[PDB]
Amino acid sequence: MVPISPIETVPVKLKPGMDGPKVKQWPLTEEKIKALVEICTEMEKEGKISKIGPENPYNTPVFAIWRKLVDFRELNKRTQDFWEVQLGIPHPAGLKKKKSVTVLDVGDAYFSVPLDEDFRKYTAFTIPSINNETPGIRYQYNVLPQGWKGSPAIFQSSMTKILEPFAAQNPDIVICQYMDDLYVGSDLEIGQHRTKIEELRQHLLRWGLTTPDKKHQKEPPFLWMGYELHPDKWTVQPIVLPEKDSWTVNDIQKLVGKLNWASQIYPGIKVRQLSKLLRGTKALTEVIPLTEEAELELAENREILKEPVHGVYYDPSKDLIAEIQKQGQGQWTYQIYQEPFKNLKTGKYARMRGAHTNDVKQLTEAVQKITTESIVIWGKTPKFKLPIQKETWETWWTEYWQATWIPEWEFVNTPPLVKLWYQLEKEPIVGAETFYVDGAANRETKLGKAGYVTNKGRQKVVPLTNTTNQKTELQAIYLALQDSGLEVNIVTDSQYALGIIQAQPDKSESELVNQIIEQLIKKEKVYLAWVPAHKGIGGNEQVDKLV
Amino acid sequence: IETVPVKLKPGMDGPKVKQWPLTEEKIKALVEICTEMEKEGKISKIGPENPYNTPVFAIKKKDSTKWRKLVDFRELNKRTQDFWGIPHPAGLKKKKSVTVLDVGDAYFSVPLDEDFRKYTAFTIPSINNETPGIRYQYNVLPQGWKGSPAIFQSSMTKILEPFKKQNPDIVIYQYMDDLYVGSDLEIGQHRTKIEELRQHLLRWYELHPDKWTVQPIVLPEKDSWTVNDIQKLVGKLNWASQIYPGIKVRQLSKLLRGTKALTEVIPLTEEAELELAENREILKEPVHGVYYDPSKDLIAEIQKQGQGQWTYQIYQEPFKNLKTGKYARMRGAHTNDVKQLTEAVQKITTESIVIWGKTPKFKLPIQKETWETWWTEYWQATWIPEWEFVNTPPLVKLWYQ
Numbered sequence A: 001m002v003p004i005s006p007i008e009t010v011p012v013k014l015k016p017g018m019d020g021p022k023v024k025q026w027p028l029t030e031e032k033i034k035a036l037v038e039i040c041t042e043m044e045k046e047g048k049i050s051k052i053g054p055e056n057p058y059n060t061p062v063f064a065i066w067r068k069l070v071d072f073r074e075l076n077k078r079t080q081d082f083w084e085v086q087l088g089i090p091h092p093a094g095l096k097k098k099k100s101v102t103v104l105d106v107g108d109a110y111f112s113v114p115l116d117e118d119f120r121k122y123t124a125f126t127i128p129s130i131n132n133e134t135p136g137i138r139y140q141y142n143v144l145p146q147g148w149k150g151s152p153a154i155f156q157s158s159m160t161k162i163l164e165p166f167a168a169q170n171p172d173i174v175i176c177q178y179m180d181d182l183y184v185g186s187d188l189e190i191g192q193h194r195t196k197i198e199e200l201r202q203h204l205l206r207w208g209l210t211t212p213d214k215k216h217q218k219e220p221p222f223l224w225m226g227y228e229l230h231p232d233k234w235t236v237q238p239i240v241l242p243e244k245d246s247w248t249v250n251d252i253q254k255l256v257g258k259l260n261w262a263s264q265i266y267p268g269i270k271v272r273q274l275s276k277l278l279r280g281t282k283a284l285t286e287v288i289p290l291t292e293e294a295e296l297e298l299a300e301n302r303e304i305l306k307e308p309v310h311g312v313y314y315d316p317s318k319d320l321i322a323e324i325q326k327q328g329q330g331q332w333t334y335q336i337y338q339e340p341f342k343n344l345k346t347g348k349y350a351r352m353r354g355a356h357t358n359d360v361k362q363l364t365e366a367v368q369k370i371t372t373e374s375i376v377i378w379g380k381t382p383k384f385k386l387p388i389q390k391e392t393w394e395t396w397w398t399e400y401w402q403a404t405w406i407p408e409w410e411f412v413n414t415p416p417l418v419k420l421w422y423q424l425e426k427e428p429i430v431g432a433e434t435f436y437v438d439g440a441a442n443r444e445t446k447l448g449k450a451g452y453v454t455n456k457g458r459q460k461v462v463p464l465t466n467t468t469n470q471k472t473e474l475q476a477i478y479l480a481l482q483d484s485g486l487e488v489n490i491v492t493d494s495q496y497a498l499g500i501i502q503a504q505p506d507k508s509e510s511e512l513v514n515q516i517i518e519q520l521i522k523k524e525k526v527y528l529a530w531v532p533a534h535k536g537i538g539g540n541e542q543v544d545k546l547v
Numbered sequence B: 001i002e003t004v005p006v007k008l009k010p011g012m013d014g015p016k017v018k019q020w021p022l023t024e025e026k027i028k029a030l031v032e033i034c035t036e037m038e039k040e041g042k043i044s045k046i047g048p049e050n051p052y053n054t055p056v057f058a059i060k061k062k063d064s065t066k067w068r069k070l071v072d073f074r075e076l077n078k079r080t081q082d083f084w085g086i087p088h089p090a091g092l093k094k095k096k097s098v099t100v101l102d103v104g105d106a107y108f109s110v111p112l113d114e115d116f117r118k119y120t121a122f123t124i125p126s127i128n129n130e131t132p133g134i135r136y137q138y139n140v141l142p143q144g145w146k147g148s149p150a151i152f153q154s155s156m157t158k159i160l161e162p163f164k165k166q167n168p169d170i171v172i173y174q175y176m177d178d179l180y181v182g183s184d185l186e187i188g189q190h191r192t193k194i195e196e197l198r199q200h201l202l203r204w205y206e207l208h209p210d211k212w213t214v215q216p217i218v219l220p221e222k223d224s225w226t227v228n229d230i231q232k233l234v235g236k237l238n239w240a241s242q243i244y245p246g247i248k249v250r251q252l253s254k255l256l257r258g259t260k261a262l263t264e265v266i267p268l269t270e271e272a273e274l275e276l277a278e279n280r281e282i283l284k285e286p287v288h289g290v291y292y293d294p295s296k297d298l299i300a301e302i303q304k305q306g307q308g309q310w311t312y313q314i315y316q317e318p319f320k321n322l323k324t325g326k327y328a329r330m331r332g333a334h335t336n337d338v339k340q341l342t343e344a345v346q347k348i349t350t351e352s353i354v355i356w357g358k359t360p361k362f363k364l365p366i367q368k369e370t371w372e373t374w375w376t377e378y379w380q381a382t383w384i385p386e387w388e389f390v391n392t393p394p395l396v397k398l399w400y401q
């Protein structure tokens, strides 16, 4: 016998202060008991488990479905935490094309790696006896049990330590590990590649690990985690938008699932309306009628999902590009590619929950998202193509009160272009009328007034019902914008209004703010000045609106 | 060569902080650096039985192309037991000059307590999550951990004993991986003395706090005031009345009676000139009842002023500034707001370390996603402060300009 190299065990403990599991074994039928006795007899003959005496106080239930199924949920609750290395799956767009590629599933994955001996006593389980007239057969696991908390992490670390020297001494190939399957790729000739695959099977055999003696039953295209991996391209598994007479909540969540998943390769997928119909529902069976916006959006989704679209693999020798387009209503779409018309991947970005916004902030956020995703997938920041003029960006970031930055980018003239819709003056305007505005409301009756007095003697006061102080301050500014020329100075004491306008929104939830924005867009020059209230500043007429 | 027992605070587990994504060149730099450290025994690979993690990345300090490994030990620092203390040298800020030295290598010769090593675990990430991350744990005192200067304090005292006994006029302070050396010599004599101290430490950053002062609130001096000038003046004085008691604005607001054009010149009355003069006198004095409390946090606020100019205030209670400043330095960041902000945060944290011996909590005028995306690209210090994000534009910005 050729000596098998031992696999070093991982020392495992339980959570602090806790004890091993002690669960009552379920009564099983005679058939199930016989089946489990046969299975456990074979496993004991193979060495996966071993019989134990009555000293072991711990017990974990067992089932037969024959196949043995041990329910480790309690021991999983009581087992220590491990470093789970499977967080975020490798994206196909990050893979690098290889001439020859092989997939090797390892046989008896968890059952070929030994368990820490001091921990084996917590894996104890009993097989009930026929008519329960004898003590049940007691067993404990000697290897990593399927379903136990620590099996995937310990198996992955052991496999990594075993594969380390082979990968080190074979730099002309690439090896990757995922669950119970290994992916080996190389640009060598098919003969050299199959040879090195044999060398890998031998290296794994030196530790007592079994590889397919037959030809590997997995050949391209590979269907993996909703993906289609082809020798030269990748895509998503087919996305079919069904025809429904009435769409319920689960049908809409299925649709937004297929659309969110399909959006990573299909450019232009919109999910704003279909997900908007799910806002504040919390009912899985509630039927929600489709708005015409959601029907048109679904029609465009069917028009995009008509014929299949594929993505290419990553080539590190070519530059990485990411192009952004505005879609409207806070929707943005982007393509990441290295050659024109050949996308590595695509995606979308929806604006955050806010009361005021503008397009430049949303574009900035989308850029940050694409940057982080690209660093995850490819390890570098792409060069951007953005629908915004260099002059627009310079004016924005130079005049914006917050610090902001976009990585290297260039302008692409693909409408609709992001622009600045208005710009307030830095100094008062000579020759422009000065509107002193104010508004005030009663907290009980919700009655208020908003108006202005100007330096030319122009005046106005308007009474309002069902209003607040903030609403009347905004309304006063709005009246000044309505009744003034193309150039106007506006004096207010509202820290609220100044806080809103100084954030420079081009779209808002409040219709009053949006009306103010529409007025500002029509003006040539606007200087907005602030003064303290109730300080005796003439012109600032708090008494005129408190009547 | 003898490990000192170190534990965590009662009821607190080890740090479990997600490692953020890194570019390829930073990953390679960390692979080479950590390979060398493993050959030196400073770190060792660990298995999956270690669930703890602390983020790691790579920087390039000043005047150097070699990469450096930076570990974000903030969580482990706040979860590590309090070590005890030495009173802060209140004369370090008074000294004419201070030089900062990186004594981080000295920590790597002292072993780390066995049972504690598993809490210093970090992960070198892989691109696209292809291969598992390379997990390490420290065997010696790590740079960036607050326990490293506390443990090495005795050895550092023994090493710096001859130099301290030689020059009683030189102040020496230690914070994390940095040694602050203050004196009153000439720049050349200071540099030769710093070389003397570095070769003194070998066989075993020009700062000038004297050129820094606290900034008063100043008012314009004009011969002709417009309506806008007087309105802004009244706003600034009304804001300053929150800090200074006797500020009075009624005689200046009396000039604004009537609805006049913003650009119209208004002559000041005699009562308004007297009021403005009294306000100047009030503003020339320091703030009433402003003290430092070592039991409270320091808060630093930064405002972007444009044209590469930035303002900041360090306080503990609102309107009770302990320090104010204006950083306008231009150093290869002319076209990048985030790099400027990052250098400003580093300078303010340095001044805070010199003055009080601890780092402040920043309020940054930047969106969270932008800052957290880009700040590690321009970081050059060995410590990291805490920060929050300001999303509403503060009105008082121009009152600090």
Ligand SMILES: C=CC(=O)Nc1cc(Oc2ccccc2OCCn2ccc(=O)[nH]c2=O)c(C)c2cc(C#N)ccc12
Binding pocket: A090, A095, A096, A097, A098, A099, A101, A102, A103, A174, A175, A176, A183, A184, A185, A186, A218, A220, A222, A223, A224, A229, A230, A231, A232, A313, B129, B130, B131
């Ligand atoms: C970390 C991620 C990773 O390695 N993922 C994967 C890699 C892989 O092959 C490679 C193995 C070694 C190096 C690069 C590889 O692919 C480069 C791109 N590529 C992909 C397909 C193909 O035919 N030709 C081609 O060049 C295969 C076959 C995979 C199969 C499954 C299934 N089921 C799931 C994931 C796979």
